[PDB]
Design a protein around this nucleic acid. Structure first.
Ligand SMILES: Nc1ncnc2c1ncn2[C@@H]1O[C@H](COP(=O)(O)OP(=O)(O)O)[C@@H](O)[C@H]1O
Ligand SMILES: Nc1ncnc2c1ncn2[C@@H]1O[C@H](COP(=O)(O)OP(=O)(O)O)[C@@H](O)[C@H]1O
Ligand SMILES: Nc1ncnc2c1ncn2[C@@H]1O[C@H](COP(=O)(O)OP(=O)(O)O)[C@@H](O)[C@H]1O
Ligand code: ALF
Ligand code: ALF
Ligand code: ALF
Ligand SMILES: [Mg+2]
Ligand SMILES: [Mg+2]
Ligand SMILES: [Mg+2]
Ligand SMILES: [Zn+2]
Ligand SMILES: [Zn+2]
Ligand SMILES: [Zn+2]
Ligand SMILES: [Zn+2]
Lengths: 367, 334, 366, 367, 367
DNA sequence: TTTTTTCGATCGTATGTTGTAACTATCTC
DNA sequence: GAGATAGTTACAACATACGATCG
């Protein structure tokens, strides 16, 4: 049946994984040299492919041809693991199996030989959610398990794990994917899927992904669903609520000159237009950073801001650097606590007021 | 659970996706309280569970529709906090996850509805991740919240997000006037207090909350000239303390805006009170009081089992203390 | 509506209907049971949203057709409390139902029948009938290997496969496998399904050795079993099941033929000193020689020597005595044939007389 | 390939690194014959608690007698090395912590040892035992049979009841020094015939804190990444830590208030694609080291020798107040980094803030 | 060989037990005058002589000569009780057997007359671990005891027992053994054992005992093992330093006197032993708070902190309150900013340096 | 003449109630 | 003199109440 792009495009081979070059190289070298460890812990941010890497490693370990860094993907073991019904691969959702009894039952079955595979692989997802007793019970077996069992751990909060467990595992840190890599993957996926797209939309989606590929795929699917089956720049801009125009410049100028009425009128008009406040704050922070950097050196200004260059230069001539730092810090603080305010508009207004002080029926089936 | 007209367009989009089969298995709807997201979710689930739907409307006479009306459909698992509690435990989530493994009894689709994603504890949110990532075939999820940034990043990244935009202010005011009979200024004040979300203002009018607001306004008017804010305690010690603290913060913000000079304010029905508040206090003091009120409201809503009386008494005592000359005012910090 | 029946006939169908119902209904409707008087019969149905049990009793006495719901616990208490031979009359008076239990009149609440979640339209993917003896034999010989509670939810059930003209039952838990097969004399399409353990247990308890045949229907998402005047409906795991063929060892060469009774006695005697926690034993196989060794944490050793017909090379292999004893008990044959390849491979067990049923045990590597 | 940790477990008192006091005490006790019946071992993870416990158990049951220098070749020593001796009852308290298990264990302690002169019970992860389990052992610990000895190992002795602590001799193991870890790694690599460099060993020892098992795991990971060899570049890539030279140069540029040089170096680092958080942490560490050098000349070790002299120059010229101001500014910048629009923007703004409030050469004000 | 020093020197006569004069005198007078209660309950800390006194009372309550406070020690009953194999003396370890069935059987056994003794004494040890039903059965048996049955109870947490059981027995509470008595007992034991010793070593051992003779004997045995058959000042001091775990108070004392090298040495020593830095910081905060409260009122320091009473009292007496307040404030700031420090140890060192030789500048309300 | 507590998730011990299987004793062939 | 059926005892599984630790 139909499956979302996030799960349908899961990598199936070591050649379909973007980035993480050091981890893949280390795994390939270990498999080739025969130096196989019994405890691997993949740590990093979310949406980077810890589970996919673990599954690929398990598939490579239990391939019919042999222990290879390039799984065939066609033998019975590989396809069985892909379908998720492989007997010797025990996938344990640690977030729902935190009790000690489950772990004790698991560790009492480690002495039996594998059914059909050459190794018995335990893939524990989100191991950071287990209780202390579970970790202590694991410790002994994980220190020196039998020769036919391998442990694979995937987590996003390595701080939770006690130092005792970390001291007896091979840790692999996954980096956050860059904007270019995310854009390349997105365009490749869209071309394979026969979906029209434009470079600007892909650039915006990659920038908004914040280094997570799953987030990028989710945003792309949302745009496709709301974009009438087309990834258009206008549709993505509307969905993301990009400022586009020079509203942030006007707001920051009004704040700097300390004109309460002007800034309040601008905020009221923006609220009437219904824009995203987080985007506005990010744009203002970027403008402040650019102004400060230009004040450092006149040539630091980029070429993309020529249309609004002159005005910005005046700010760099009229505002001391300390005031710029104060405004940036206040805007950053306002951004930090925006969710906790009773209303987003109230939070923005409070932040701006703080900054201003700085101066010398067709009802289908529902009741 | 009433069907507001302004929900008609958005629905027309979502159902269309489910008509083509290219519907996301985890939809997260962002909307303010009183917008009617629950009605939209109920309509979508009802359409999904109908055996032989026509167009965008459920037939209303098949077995699925009959069971839905009776409210005893074997499918359609619902997660909500206990009657006496206000949070969703891990046990219910794990039970639903275990039950989802088996086939659908009626041979149709399985629908899971979360009443409010923000009420989930850390354990429940972490447990639901794997189920949301790779749900069985013909399984649909529906989550509702008012601030998706509060949810875990891992949980958020697994859901397709749809946002409901409140209607224009003029349309909301006209609808409220058609519904309830009140002065235009009162309607505008109620609408602005509800972040421009019609339905919440109607709920505010229906209850005795308006009388409580009037009592609080009178108490504040008496207290401000005297400088004895402790008297406000009787008007704030209640199970709905967060709403009254929000009202007080709105009044303070309106006073500060008037002090700075502005044309648009939230409290439109009490110009005299806001003018008096602005006259009798300095902008810095107003800012400090607003910050303290917001912080206390956040603490009250966040911590569980906290005694509201002591917190409010300490807040009022600090507010009275600040007004004294030569006192270090607080400053926001990271 | 109005009907009078003897207590003897009414008692026992009511017990079966109330069986699946538990102490906690969790919903007003599920607590009650649906009673429907139609034509010349009364049908009592009870469900818990997972399994449905319905019983039908023919009524000869005058009755008024109807369909309503009655609380299960109250009706069970009323029927149990009365003395022997009492005649029970029931009549629906408006919103309430009046039961003339002997000389005492009781009132019970009645809820609308349209709100009862019971299947109405049934479509069968396959359907057939077979004597109860075959089903009992298959379930008894395959259930002991079924898993109880494990992460792999697809292993917590039993696999029924209609292949060609025969029916096959498979069970496993990741440590041992049990396979049985029997012909039924009817051509069926290739179709595999998984039944949850609770449904299997309920079906096994349902059988009683009666001569009446059992009818089995399998739909897209449900399995129905009809025996006599009782119908039991259950749902399916729907999680895919690994093929048993790959589990069986390929080209086994070492073969041991022995007496079932002798092996059972030897294993039972050796298990006395076996470790209680693991219950592990060691087998040394040599020319017409089987040496069984058991050890204990406190260095208590037990040894047994058995004479068999073996011609292969010497071998040493560990095992779990409990699984071997269970397999021998379930086999129920005079001679036992064990096929093995090496000291780290799975070992197959069957009876030399016939190959209808087979078992596989994975060695305990130490 | 058996992992290095399991392969290189000590098998004699001459193969243990450090822990001189406990080894001397045990040797004296075994030589003089004054043998207790309850030993407790405490210390941080991976410092040789179970190893020394097993060595002591082997020494007690050696066929030649009770000596502090076990032969290591007799049947008892070989069986204990292979972990299958009958008289060494090893218990994983983390896995079996219920009271009934303790009752069953104690019900059969009167029986004489099967083959050895002593029946040694070695309990691991004692702190996981329940309170009832702790209470059940008091009488047996106080007055055990003459042919029974108890060995206990735990990581947090403060979790045990005071009653048990008063019944057994306590030995606390200390974290191994950097030099000892480096020497052990060098010896192991030489025995394994693996290429290595002094810098790689120094970095691994520094990153291993004080647990030798962590050092061995890191060495194995480096060997896997380095494709059969240990190289300084491979270790640096694995740890993801930039060389101290770049951070030191950046700090020096910041101190002298050279905005252009700082910006150029930041651009060069961005071209290198290093992590910003690591850069900030390294700068903070350098400032802390300078402050400690100001506190006392001996606060600087030989690990910084390559730059020591130059670093020392900064100690005798920067007033302490300036050092504190820079440290606090960088700490605040790192605190607020997550909410910044971009990591690069955050670091650049932090550096600009530091330059603006420079005590001696602040940026010019407007006119 | 040599048995165990603690186990060998268990007192066997009322003249050998040291201290606890009131309990011994009361028991002797009661036995002499014939005033014998139906149930006794001994309470106190660990290793004070509860079991020893109970056994002595049992021995003196069934001597062949008669009921006396000075048992002969030569008749059959005394010898058998010393060997712990007397027929009438039914000693039960309540910790190992807490279920209702065992207590039921033991209490039903009382219906039989004594075999070869005037009394049949039950010595229940660790009574606080019995089950609720066991307590009910014991109360039922103890309400109307026979004339020939006596109950002796030893416990360390009497508050766990129900009030009903407490009301039916006479309770004797033991006190700490004090330094002088422990020192004298150690001197006597070492003189009897023909082992060289020095007065300062014995004084240090007695001080470290902390009112527990068993702990003193265990430490003496460990020191003898470390000292190679003798007790010396240097060996005992090194042993205590290895076992010393009060780095927080030492750090506070060193900081308050403006010493830098001592603070660095203490930090290194703390780092040698596995310790959580935040735990150390909060411990220092608690110590400073306690010192401040003691300065406010001399009664603030309770009996719990008896070990370090003298040093804390001296610090409170000498240090002015303002310095304590400043140290508390700076350490609180350090604790607040710890998680963002480059390293836990570096953060702690920086905070210690700030508290040692720095002074923060308060905001000082300017308006 | 009285007055008096935060909540969720997890682990461990002891007692009482119900159901199923195996062993022993008694009756009839 | 042996086999089959019924009754009693023992073991395993499930439910309730109480106490303790960490976030
Ligand atoms: N390196 C990568 N290359 C391609 N796709 C990726 C990568 N990392 C993640 N994804 C996508 O993200 C989805 C979920 O990844 P997941 O296994 O959840 O990673 P993690 O366990 O780190 O969250 C996958 O379906 C996959 O398409
Ligand atoms: N003193 C030591 N000498 C040599 N190796 C050691 C020492 N301490 C620890 N190790 C190494 O640490 C690894 C694990 O030690 P382990 O037995 O787990 O100690 P612990 O029981 O304290 O965790 C071993 O592989 C061993 O080589
Ligand atoms: N007053 C004392 N005189 C001499 N030795 C004592 C004294 N009190 C305790 N001991 C020592 O303590 C051990 C007995 O412990 P005990 O105090 O009976 O345990 P508890 O009091 O905790 O029940 C003996 O080895 C004995 O030498
Ligand atoms: F599945 Al992830 F971070 F590992 F969302
Ligand atoms: F085995 Al350890 F500290 F990890 F003793
Ligand atoms: F012997 Al004790 F408490 F240590 F009774
Ligand atoms: Mg994952
Ligand atoms: Mg260990
Ligand atoms: Mg004692
Ligand atoms: Zn393959
Ligand atoms: Zn319908
Ligand atoms: Zn030896
Ligand atoms: Zn005597």
């Amino acid at each position: 049946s139909y499956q979302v792009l996030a799960r349908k495009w899961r990598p199936q081979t070591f050649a379909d994984v973007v980035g993480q070059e050091h981890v893949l190289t280390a795994l390939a070298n270990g498999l080739s040299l025969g130096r196989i460890h019994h405890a691997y812990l993949f740590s990093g941010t979310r949406g980077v492919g810890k589970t996919s890497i673990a599954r690929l490693l398990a598939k490579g370990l239990n391939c019919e041809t042999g222990i290879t860094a390039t799984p065939c993907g066609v033998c019975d073991n590989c396809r069985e693991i892909e379908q998720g019904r492989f007997v010797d691969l025990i996938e344990i959702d640690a977030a729902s199996r935190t009790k000690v009894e489950d772990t004790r039952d698991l560790l009492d079955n480690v002495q039996y030989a594998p059914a059909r595979g050459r190794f018995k692989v335990y893939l524990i997802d989100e191991v950071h959610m287990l209780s202390r007793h579970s970790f202590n019970a694991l410790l002994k077996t994980l220190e020196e398990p039998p020769e036919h069992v391998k442990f694979l751990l995937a987590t996003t909060d390595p701080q939770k794990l006690p130092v005792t467990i970390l001291s007896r595992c091979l840790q692999f840190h996954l980096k956050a994917l860059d904007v270019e890599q995310i854009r390349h993957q997105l365009e490749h996926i869209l071309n394979e899927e026969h979906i029209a797209h434009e470079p600007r939309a892909l650039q915006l989606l990659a920038r908004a992904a914040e280094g997570s590929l799953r987030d990028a795929l989710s945003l792309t699917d949302q745009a496709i669903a709301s974009g009438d089956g087309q990834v258009s720049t206008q549709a993505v801009s509307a969905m993301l609520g990009t400022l586009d125009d020079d509203q942030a410049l006007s707001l920051v100028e009004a704040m700097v000159e300390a004109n309460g009425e002007r800034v309040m009128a601008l905020i009221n008009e923006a609220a009437a237009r219904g824009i995203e406040w987080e985007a506005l704050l990010v744009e203002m922070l970027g403008l402040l950073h650019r102004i400060a950097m230009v004040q450092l050196s006149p040539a630091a200004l980029g070429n993309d801001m020529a249309a609004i260059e002159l005005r910005m230069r005046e700010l760099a001539r009229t505002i001391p650097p300390t005031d710029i730092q104060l405004y940036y810090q206040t805007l950053l603080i306002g951004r930090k606590e925006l969710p906790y305010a009773p209303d987003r508009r109230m939070g923005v207004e409070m932040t701006l007021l703080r900054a201003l002080a700085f101066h010398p029926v067709p009802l289908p089936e529902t009741t | 659970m009433r069907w507001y007209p302004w929900l008609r367009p958005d629905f027309e989009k979502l159902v269309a996706s489910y008509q083509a089969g290219r519907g996301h298995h985890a939809l997260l709807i962002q909307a303010l309280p009183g917008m009617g997201d629950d009605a939209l979710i109920y309509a979508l689930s009802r359409y999904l569970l109908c055996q032989q739907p026509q167009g965008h409307k459920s037939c209303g006479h098949c077995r699925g529709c009959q069971l839905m009306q009776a409210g005893t459909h074997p499918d359609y698992y619902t997660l909500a906090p206990e009657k006496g509690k206000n949070t969703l435990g891990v046990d219910a989530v794990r039970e639903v996850t275990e039950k989802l493994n088996e086939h659908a009894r009626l041979g149709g689709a399985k629908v899971v509805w979360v009443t409010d994603a923000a009420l989930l504890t850390d354990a429940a949110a972490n447990a639901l991740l794997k189920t949301l990532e790779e749900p069985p075939a013909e399984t649909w999820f529906f989550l509702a919240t008012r601030e998706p940034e509060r949810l875990l990043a891992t949980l958020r990244s697994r859901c397709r997000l749809h946002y409901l935009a409140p209607p224009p202010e003029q349309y909301a005011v006209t609808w409220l006037s058609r519904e309830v009979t009140m002065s235009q200024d009162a309607l505008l004040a109620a609408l602005r207090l509800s972040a421009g979300s019609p339905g919440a203002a109607l709920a505010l009018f229906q209850g005795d909350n308006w009388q409580a607001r009037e009592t609080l306004c009178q108490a504040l008017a008496y207290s401000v000239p005297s400088g004895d804010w402790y008297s406000l305690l009787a008007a704030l010690n209640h199970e709905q303390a967060p709403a009254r603290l929000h009202w007080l913060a709105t009044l303070l913000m309106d006073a500060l805006k008037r002090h700075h000079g502005a044309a648009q304010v939230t409290n439109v029905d009490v110009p005299g009170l806001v003018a008096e508040l602005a006259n009798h206090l300095s902008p810095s003091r107003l800012q400090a009081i607003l910050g303290d009120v917001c912080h206390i409201r956040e603490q009250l809503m966040s911590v569980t089992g906290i005694n509201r009386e002591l917190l409010i008494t300490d807040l009022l005592l600090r507010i009275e203390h600040y007004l004294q000359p030569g006192v270090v005012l607080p400053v926001p910090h990271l | 509506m109005k009907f009078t029946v003897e207590r003897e006939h009414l008692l026992k169908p009511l017990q079966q209907v109330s069986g699946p119902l538990g102490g906690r209904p969790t919903l007003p409707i599920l607590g009650n049971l649906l009673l429907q008087v139609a034509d010349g019969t009364l049908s009592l149905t009870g469900t818990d949203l997972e399994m449905e049990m319905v019983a039908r009793v023919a009524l000869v006495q005058p009755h008024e057709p109807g369909a309503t719901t009655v609380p299960a616990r109250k009706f069970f208490d009323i029927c149990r409390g009365l003395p022997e031979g009492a005649e029970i009359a029931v009549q629906l008076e408006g919103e309430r139902m009046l039961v003339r239990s002997g000389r005492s009149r009781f009132s019970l609440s009645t809820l609308p029948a349209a709100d009862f979640p019971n299947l109405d339209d049934w479509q069968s993917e396959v359907e057939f009938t077979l004597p109860q003896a075959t089903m009992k034999r298959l379930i008894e010989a395959t259930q002991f290997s079924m898993a109880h509670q494990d992460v792999r939810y697809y292993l917590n059930g039993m696999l029924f496969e209609t292949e060609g003209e025969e029916l096959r039952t498979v069970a496993t838990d990741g440590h041992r496998l049990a396979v049985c097969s029997m012909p039924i004399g009817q051509s069926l399409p290739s179709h595999s399904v998984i039944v949850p353990r609770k449904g299997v247990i309920e079906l096994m308890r349902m059988l009683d050795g009666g001569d009446n045949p059992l009818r089995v229907q399998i739909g897209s998402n449900n399995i129905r079993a009809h025996v006599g005047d009782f119908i039991f409906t259950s749902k399916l795991v729907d999680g895919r099941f690994p093929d048993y063929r790959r589990v069986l060892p390929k080209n086994p060469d070492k073969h041991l033929e022995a007496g079932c009774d002798l092996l059972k006695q030897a294993f039972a005697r050796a298990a006395i000193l076996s470790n209680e926690k693991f219950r592990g034993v060691r087998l040394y196989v040599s020319e017409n020689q089987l040496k069984i060794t058991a050890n204990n944490p406190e260095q208590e050793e037990a040894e047994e020597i058995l004479d068999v017909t073996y011609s292969g090379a010497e071998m040493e292999i560990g095992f779990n005595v409990s699984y071997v004893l269970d397999v021998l008990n379930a086999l129920k044959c005079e001679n036992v044939r064990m096929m093995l390849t090496d000291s780290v491979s799975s070992v197959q067990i069957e009876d030399a007389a016939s190959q209808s049923a087979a078992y596989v045990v994975m060695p305990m590597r130490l």
